[PDB]
Amino acid sequence: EAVKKWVNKIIEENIIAVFAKTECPYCIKAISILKGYNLNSHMHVENIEKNPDMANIQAYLKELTGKSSVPRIFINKDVVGGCDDLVKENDEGKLKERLQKLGLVN
Incomplete structure (x- = not known):
């Protein structure tokens, strides 16, 4: 309960x-790509390895996204996925589209 609530607050309180x-x-790499869009002001990076509940967090991230690995990336609560998912979205224009709809890039 506590772990899910804590993960949820990170996702729901940071675009x-x-x-x-x-x-x-x-x-x-993923964080660098995102900062390249000048998203810093609306980013939160959580190091889940430096946490006593890493496995519980990873398991919940897998329930939410299909994978337990990091990085795990959410944009306004929607699942992007991992770095490779981000690269695909970036290269194909989907990332910029997401960000435009959020007013994060012109």
């Missing part, structure tokens, strides 16, 4: 929510 771990190249 761009990224769950990450320590020393994770694909986390770093």
Whole structure:
């Protein structure tokens, strides 16, 4: 209960929510791509490895998204997925479209 509530508050209180771990190249890449859209002011990165409940968080992220791995990326509560999902959306114009609808990019 407590774990789900805590994860939910991160997702629901930050337009761009990224769950990450320590020393994770694909986390770093995803975060860098998002910051490249000047999204910093609406981003929250949570390092779930530095947490006593990592496994519970990962399991919940899998319930929400289909995967337990990090990074796990949400944009206004919608599931983007991982870094590879973000790259696909970015390259195909879907990421910019999401962000335009949110007023985050012109």
